[PDB]
Design a protein around this motif. Structure first.
Motif, PDB file in Angstrom:
ATOM      1  N   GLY A  73      56.808  61.357  17.587  1.00  0.00           N
ATOM      2  CA  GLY A  73      57.750  60.459  16.922  1.00  0.00           C
ATOM      3  C   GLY A  73      59.064  61.073  16.465  1.00  0.00           C
ATOM      4  N   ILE A  74      60.013  60.195  16.166  1.00  0.00           N
ATOM      5  CA  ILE A  74      61.281  60.558  15.546  1.00  0.00           C
ATOM      6  C   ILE A  74      61.201  60.290  14.034  1.00  0.00           C
ATOM      7  CG2 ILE A  74      63.757  60.094  15.567  1.00  0.00           C
ATOM      8  CD1 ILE A  74      62.634  61.211  18.187  1.00  0.00           C
ATOM      9  N   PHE A  75      61.451  61.321  13.228  1.00  0.00           N
ATOM     10  CA  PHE A  75      61.348  61.233  11.768  1.00  0.00           C
ATOM     11  C   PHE A  75      62.633  61.622  11.035  1.00  0.00           C
ATOM     12  CE2 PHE A  75      57.166  61.848  13.492  1.00  0.00           C
ATOM     13  CZ  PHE A  75      56.412  60.929  12.799  1.00  0.00           C
ATOM     14  N   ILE A  76      62.893  60.965   9.910  1.00  0.00           N
ATOM     15  CA  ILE A  76      63.992  61.330   9.020  1.00  0.00           C
ATOM     16  C   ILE A  76      63.564  62.577   8.235  1.00  0.00           C
ATOM     17  CG2 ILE A  76      65.403  60.592   6.992  1.00  0.00           C
ATOM     18  CD1 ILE A  76      65.083  57.754   7.902  1.00  0.00           C
ATOM     19  N   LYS A  77      64.362  63.644   8.329  1.00  0.00           N
ATOM     20  CA  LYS A  77      64.151  64.873   7.571  1.00  0.00           C
ATOM     21  C   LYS A  77      64.880  64.829   6.241  1.00  0.00           C
ATOM     22  CE  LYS A  77      62.909  69.371   7.210  1.00  0.00           C
ATOM     23  NZ  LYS A  77      61.483  69.768   7.167  1.00  0.00           N
ATOM     24  N   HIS A  78      66.138  64.385   6.282  1.00  0.00           N
ATOM     25  CA  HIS A  78      67.014  64.321   5.112  1.00  0.00           C
ATOM     26  C   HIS A  78      67.897  63.113   5.139  1.00  0.00           C
ATOM     27  CE1 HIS A  78      66.326  68.801   4.845  1.00  0.00           C
ATOM     28  NE2 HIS A  78      66.122  68.401   3.605  1.00  0.00           N
ATOM     29  N   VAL A  79      68.230  62.662   3.922  1.00  0.00           N
ATOM     30  CA  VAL A  79      69.200  61.611   3.684  1.00  0.00           C
ATOM     31  C   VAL A  79      70.289  62.113   2.733  1.00  0.00           C
ATOM     32  CG1 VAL A  79      69.535  59.304   2.782  1.00  0.00           C
ATOM     33  CG2 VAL A  79      67.502  59.830   4.100  1.00  0.00           C
ATOM     34  N   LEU A  80      71.536  62.043   3.182  1.00  0.00           N
ATOM     35  CA  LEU A  80      72.666  62.421   2.352  1.00  0.00           C
ATOM     36  C   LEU A  80      72.996  61.280   1.387  1.00  0.00           C
ATOM     37  CD1 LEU A  80      75.108  64.116   4.891  1.00  0.00           C
ATOM     38  CD2 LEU A  80      73.344  65.136   3.455  1.00  0.00           C
ATOM     39  N   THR A 116      67.057  52.892   0.932  1.00  0.00           N
ATOM     40  CA  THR A 116      65.654  52.654   1.312  1.00  0.00           C
ATOM     41  C   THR A 116      65.081  53.649   2.280  1.00  0.00           C
ATOM     42  OG1 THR A 116      65.871  51.008   3.136  1.00  0.00           O
ATOM     43  CG2 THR A 116      66.089  50.232   0.857  1.00  0.00           C
ATOM     44  N   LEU A 117      65.945  54.500   2.839  1.00  0.00           N
ATOM     45  CA  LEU A 117      65.513  55.503   3.786  1.00  0.00           C
ATOM     46  C   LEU A 117      65.165  56.784   3.055  1.00  0.00           C
ATOM     47  CD1 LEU A 117      68.170  54.920   6.577  1.00  0.00           C
ATOM     48  CD2 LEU A 117      65.790  54.165   6.616  1.00  0.00           C
ATOM     49  N   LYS A 118      64.079  57.426   3.483  1.00  0.00           N
ATOM     50  CA  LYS A 118      63.603  58.630   2.834  1.00  0.00           C
ATOM     51  C   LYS A 118      63.003  59.594   3.836  1.00  0.00           C
ATOM     52  CE  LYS A 118      59.813  55.692   1.465  1.00  0.00           C
ATOM     53  NZ  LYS A 118      59.036  55.763   2.726  1.00  0.00           N
ATOM     54  N   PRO A 119      62.981  60.880   3.479  1.00  0.00           N
ATOM     55  CA  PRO A 119      62.325  61.857   4.333  1.00  0.00           C
ATOM     56  C   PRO A 119      60.896  61.453   4.686  1.00  0.00           C
ATOM     57  CG  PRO A 119      63.563  62.979   2.654  1.00  0.00           C
ATOM     58  CD  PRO A 119      63.580  61.520   2.289  1.00  0.00           C
ATOM     59  N   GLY A 120      60.522  61.619   5.949  1.00  0.00           N
ATOM     60  CA  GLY A 120      59.186  61.301   6.405  1.00  0.00           C
ATOM     61  C   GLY A 120      59.089  59.947   7.090  1.00  0.00           C
ATOM     62  N   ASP A 121      60.099  59.095   6.902  1.00  0.00           N
ATOM     63  CA  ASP A 121      60.151  57.775   7.543  1.00  0.00           C
ATOM     64  C   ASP A 121      60.227  57.960   9.023  1.00  0.00           C
ATOM     65  OD1 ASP A 121      60.143  56.392   5.106  1.00  0.00           O
ATOM     66  OD2 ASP A 121      62.251  55.768   5.270  1.00  0.00           O
ATOM     67  N   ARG A 122      59.501  57.125   9.760  1.00  0.00           N
ATOM     68  CA  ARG A 122      59.535  57.166  11.215  1.00  0.00           C
ATOM     69  C   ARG A 122      60.518  56.139  11.756  1.00  0.00           C
ATOM     70  NH1 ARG A 122      54.631  57.328  15.481  1.00  0.00           N
ATOM     71  NH2 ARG A 122      55.840  57.348  17.429  1.00  0.00           N
ATOM     72  N   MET A 138      64.573  50.093  13.004  1.00  0.00           N
ATOM     73  CA  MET A 138      63.252  49.652  12.553  1.00  0.00           C
ATOM     74  C   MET A 138      62.598  50.960  12.133  1.00  0.00           C
ATOM     75  SD  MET A 138      63.320  46.385  12.894  1.00  0.00           S
ATOM     76  CE  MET A 138      61.649  46.178  12.323  1.00  0.00           C
ATOM     77  N   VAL A 139      62.122  50.989  10.899  1.00  0.00           N
ATOM     78  CA  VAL A 139      61.589  52.179  10.274  1.00  0.00           C
ATOM     79  C   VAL A 139      60.151  51.927   9.787  1.00  0.00           C
ATOM     80  CG1 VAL A 139      62.017  53.829   8.437  1.00  0.00           C
ATOM     81  CG2 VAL A 139      63.947  52.636   9.477  1.00  0.00           C
ATOM     82  N   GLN A 140      59.267  52.902   9.950  1.00  0.00           N
ATOM     83  CA  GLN A 140      57.915  52.829   9.373  1.00  0.00           C
ATOM     84  C   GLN A 140      57.932  53.699   8.120  1.00  0.00           C
ATOM     85  OE1 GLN A 140      55.518  50.903  10.744  1.00  0.00           O
ATOM     86  NE2 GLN A 140      53.708  51.533   9.586  1.00  0.00           N
ATOM     87  N   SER A 141      57.887  53.075   6.942  1.00  0.00           N
ATOM     88  CA  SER A 141      58.034  53.776   5.658  1.00  0.00           C
ATOM     89  C   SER A 141      56.700  54.007   4.954  1.00  0.00           C
ATOM     90  CB  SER A 141      58.978  52.987   4.735  1.00  0.00           C
ATOM     91  OG  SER A 141      60.305  53.028   5.250  1.00  0.00           O
ATOM     92  N   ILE A 142      55.688  53.248   5.341  1.00  0.00           N
ATOM     93  CA  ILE A 142      54.394  53.398   4.728  1.00  0.00           C
ATOM     94  C   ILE A 142      53.421  54.088   5.689  1.00  0.00           C
ATOM     95  CG2 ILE A 142      52.416  52.202   3.722  1.00  0.00           C
ATOM     96  CD1 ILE A 142      54.860  49.967   3.232  1.00  0.00           C
ATOM     97  N   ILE A 143      52.786  55.145   5.198  1.00  0.00           N
ATOM     98  CA  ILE A 143      51.777  55.882   5.945  1.00  0.00           C
ATOM     99  C   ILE A 143      50.448  55.715   5.221  1.00  0.00           C
TER     100      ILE A 143
END
Length: 89
Positions: free
Chosen positions: A26-33, A43-49, A80-85
């Motif tokens: 998968g593609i994941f967010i590492k950091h948000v500025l 609403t975007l956070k590290p770990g979001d897919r 489209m982001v998956q925020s809940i694991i």
């Protein structure tokens, strides 16, 4: 919370979107500025897919594929982001 992906629209500023991504073979967010379109959305956070960008499937995208697709997005950039694991233990 629904475990369905959620739609997130980022509005570009004339610089960057404000996310660092990792992954892809998968593609994941590492950091948000904080001071960026991504930061301002809130609403975007590290770990979001990231599963789609502008309707394009990124579930099985390579890192390079994702990078190009996001760089070549229009305005707004629709994710489209998956925020809940959930994790099975």
């Amino acid at each position: 919370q629904s475990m369905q992906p959620r739609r997130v629209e980022l509005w570009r500023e004339p610089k960057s979107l404000g996310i660092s991504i990792v992954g892809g073979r998968g593609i994941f967010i590492k950091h948000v500025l904080e001071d960026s379109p991504a930061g301002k959305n809130g609403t975007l956070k590290p770990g979001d897919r990231i599963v789609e960008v502008d309707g394009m499937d990124l579930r099985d995208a390579s890192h390079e594929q994702a990078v190009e697709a996001i760089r070549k997005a229009g305005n707004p950039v629709v994710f489209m982001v998956q925020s809940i694991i959930s994790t099975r233990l």
